[model samples]
Target chain A: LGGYMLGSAMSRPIIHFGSDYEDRYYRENMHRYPNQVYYRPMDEYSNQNNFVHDCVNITIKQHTVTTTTSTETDVKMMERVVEQMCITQYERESQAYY
Target chain B: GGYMLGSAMSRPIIHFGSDYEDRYYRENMHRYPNQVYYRPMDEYSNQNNFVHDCVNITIKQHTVNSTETDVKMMERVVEQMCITQYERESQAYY
Candidate 1:
């Protein structure tokens, strides 16, 4: 057991879709990593956030939020982590040509 | 070589009508496999035919509360049947 997490095995690939901007954002940063499959879900509405992640090999995109009250003043927010890889990099390294 | 028996009766038919058949079909045939073991099937042979005839005998033979041991026993029986059938056919041809 790697003791990383339930879905943290390197053998398996992960896929997470997010807002378009975060989607393209991570695509640019992970251009140097090895072994990753990249895809942006084609949607009718195009504008979105590009996203990214690290050490957690393969892929992870969806974000989860846990709202909590502030110690002094209560504040709530959608909190989560998103990961992405560039299509161009995926094309160069994976050789899968997706 | 790959083969399927019975032109009129097929795997997908029995695969449609039972819980075990449904599970087995999707697990073994619906996606990918070299061979498919379709669960057995039968229709009312005739009004005069007994209910036992209309029912599936292989399934009826196994208990509802069957376990992996039962499954292993069933596999052994079927494997032997296949080997015996092939041997008989080979001997007849020769």
Candidate 2:
């Protein structure tokens, strides 16, 4: 429970980089409309597993997506597989809107 | 980003705890009639501000009802009270 709460509430970097498609859409749609903020907690592409997984996985994903890779790295950032049990929270956003 | 994502993906403790009550009660009753092996998450009064708040609140209601002291406690609860021996009994402590 501690871990779960932390994953959804405390995580910043993972949330920052995850679900490129979702974030892009969220930002764009929200920005364009500037009024409608009702979004489902998850995006189709969100692959976060859980809180523990969120911290550890995002550490890896952040590195993979941001860093310049070497040959044979095989770090396909976009194709990276993440767990679904993590990173699908809207609590803070809920707080923001509320 | 890292934090919010973690909290979101953490275990569905509170939600599961909330619904676990009726499931537990029904399963307990079925045990009497030689019912099938259906079991609940039969943990007690876990008010972790997530799971079991509903159950927790109901139990607290009993505590409040059973004693004038508890009723006073409830009055204080309504009046900015905090902390108790029976804090983490159930989850429905709304």
Best-performing candidate as measured by DockQ? 2
Chain A TM-score of model 1 comes to 0.19
Interface RMSD (Å) of model 2?
15.5
Kindly report the fnat of each predicted structure, to 2 decimals.
0.00, 0.00
DockQ of candidate 1 is 0.01
lDDT of 1 by residue, A1-98 (tens): 11221221122112211223433443453332223332333234321222111212222211112121121111100111212123223233334323
For the second chain, the TM-scores of the candidates in order are 0.31, 0.18
Candidate 1, which segments miss by more than 4 Å at Cα? A1-98, B1-65
In candidate 1 the C-alpha lDDT for residue A88 amounts to 29
**DockQ for each numbered candidate:** 0.01, 0.01
